[PDB]
Structure formats: C-alpha cells, structure tokens
Symmetry: C2
Subunit: 89 residues, 2 copies
C-alpha cells in the first residue's frame, strides 16, 4: 500500500485492538486510550514533559468517557504535535 | 519503530511533503489537501462514492482555506471512516 494508506491501516488496527476489548468496538474509554498510548508508543522517556503530562492527566481525569474513532485520531494529532520531533519548531 | 509510531511518522511525513510547497510549512490549502488525498491514497475507484464525493467537494468549495496539522489529521480520520474497509459496519 501507499505510505498514507499504510498509515491509516495502522491507525485503524491499533484502534480496534483496544476498542474491541470491552463493549462496543466503535469506542474505547479514555482510561483505555491512555493505556494504548503508553503501550503503543515509545513515549516512556517523554511522559514527564509538561505538555504530554497534561494530555495524559486529562485522560485520567476523564477516564470513563468514551472515545469514538474520529476523536481518537484527532487526539493522536494533538499528541503528535508535542511528541513528534519533526513537528518541533 | 512500534506500529503506531510508524503510523504517526508517516502522517507527519506526508503532511510536510505538501505543506512545504508554498509559504508556511505549518499549513497547506484545502486545494493542496485534495491533491494530497488523490495522490497519496489509492482512492481512485472510490471518488464517486456518495460520502467521499461530498468530502472532496467540500475541499473544492473551500479551496483557499488553510489547514494546520491538527485539522489535517482530524480530516484523515473523517475520510478513513468512509474510505477504510475495516471501518465499515
């Protein structure tokens, strides 16, 4: 597949890996989203960074709210901005 | 890199490939986003699908509006919902 098609396939795969764990496969809880981020990304060395810590805390504070696919992807974009080296500057 | 890290790296790479073409590398026009989608995804056989056609038309109707990274990723999520086979049903 083309690079972007590959990217989307992976986004969908990881979403379903966690959304399929409990209830409706169309959503996952913010608690489950926090777990997903910590396990699926090599983010361990960056969790204390001021901006990433606030994103992670927001998830904890709203742990029982559900997240659909659209919101999950939007979230990944937000994280990428403060997590991806290429997006610095 | 882990699968999700790979996914994000590709999302950022494709964004910059088009955002770097004119002006500020932090945005790209909706006209440029339409081009990106048509070239970076094997979407040719699906462009007449009722829902994808409306997304594509919306881009045309708003061709000169700028799109930042966050909005670009959010858009990809919206497209994926009506474009990705795994997200059907």
């Amino acid at each position: 597949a083309c690079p972007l098609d590959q990217a989307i396939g992976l986004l969908v795969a990881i979403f379903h890996k966690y959304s399929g764990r409990e209830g409706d496969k169309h959503t996952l809880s913010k608690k489950e989203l926090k777990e997903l981020i910590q396990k699926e990304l090599t983010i361990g060395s960056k969790l204390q960074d001021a901006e990433i810590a606030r994103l992670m805390e927001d998830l904890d504070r709203n742990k029982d709210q559900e997240v659909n696919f659209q919101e999950y992807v939007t979230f990944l974009g937000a994280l990428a901005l403060i997590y991806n080296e290429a997006l610095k500057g």
